Design a protein around this ligand. Structure first.
Ligand code: QL2
Length: 215
């Protein structure tokens, strides 16, 4: 794989979003992955709807949490592969109240046919990302509440409790790192991103990696 990749440089990543006081990170991880894949599949970059998942995916638990892998199955199995646009199903859960699902009236912004779950191997995740684009990952984010910048190297790595998006890596750096998009606005971290060391399973980053398949 190349020494360094950053899918932001390809224009493939939407702006950093704001989940607010809702435990909807899993939705932001899944939808951000879809946004990137939809762009890479030859379409304009389009903001897509987290609220569709938070309100309508009853396999997951709204503001109480969820899993990207379940979200991807819901999209395909329950929603005909459709992911609505942000504008047509906008984010309403920032104050912690998810509105009831509505099935009528939204605009499809992307279509997926499935998703992949990657091996629990940072090298193989990086090699897949280098070719195919950003990867949704579960992490232990419990050490992230003081991060102001730099490469984090000794994160608590004990329990998956958050979902985020790998957008790149740098193996050349003095401490090799992953580049991760969060959903805590651009006012946290490095304009909304965190670098964690790569190669030591920091934050349990290799354990639950996946990506949508556009089709
Ligand atoms: C977010 N925000 C969030 N996530 C989880 N759990 C989670 C998310 C994920 F993407 C992958 C995982 F393995 C685990 C939450 N569990 C509780 N809460 C607060 C309601 C969570 N928020």
């Amino acid at each position: 794989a190349p020494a360094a990749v950053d899918w932001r440089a390809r224009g493939a990543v939407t702006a950093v979003k704001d989940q607010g006081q809702c435990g909807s990170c899993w939705a932001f991880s899944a939808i951000g992955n879809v946004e990137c894949q939809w762009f890479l599949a030859g379409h304009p970059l389009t903001n897509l709807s987290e609220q569709m998942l938070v309100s309508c995916d009853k396999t997951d638990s709204g503001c109480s949490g969820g899993l990207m892998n379940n979200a991807f199955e819901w999209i395909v199995q329950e929603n005909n592969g459709a992911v609505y646009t942000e504008d047509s199903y906008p984010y309403a859960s920032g104050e912690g109240i998810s509105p009831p699902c509505t099935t009528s009236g939204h605009t499809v912004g992307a279509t997926i046919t499935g998703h992949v779950e990657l091996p629990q191997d940072e090298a193989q995740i990086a090699a897949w990302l280098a070719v195919n684009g950003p990867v949704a990952v579960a992490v232990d984010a419990s050490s992230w509440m003081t991060y102001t910048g730099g490469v984090m190297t000794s994160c608590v790595s004990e329990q998956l409790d958050h979902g985020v998006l790998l957008v790149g890596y740098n193996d050349s750096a003095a401490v090799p790192y992953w580049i991760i998009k969060n959903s805590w606005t651009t006012q946290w971290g490095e304009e909304g991103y965190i670098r964690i060391a790569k190669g030591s399973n920091q934050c349990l980053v290799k354990e639950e990696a996946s990506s949508a398949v556009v089709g």
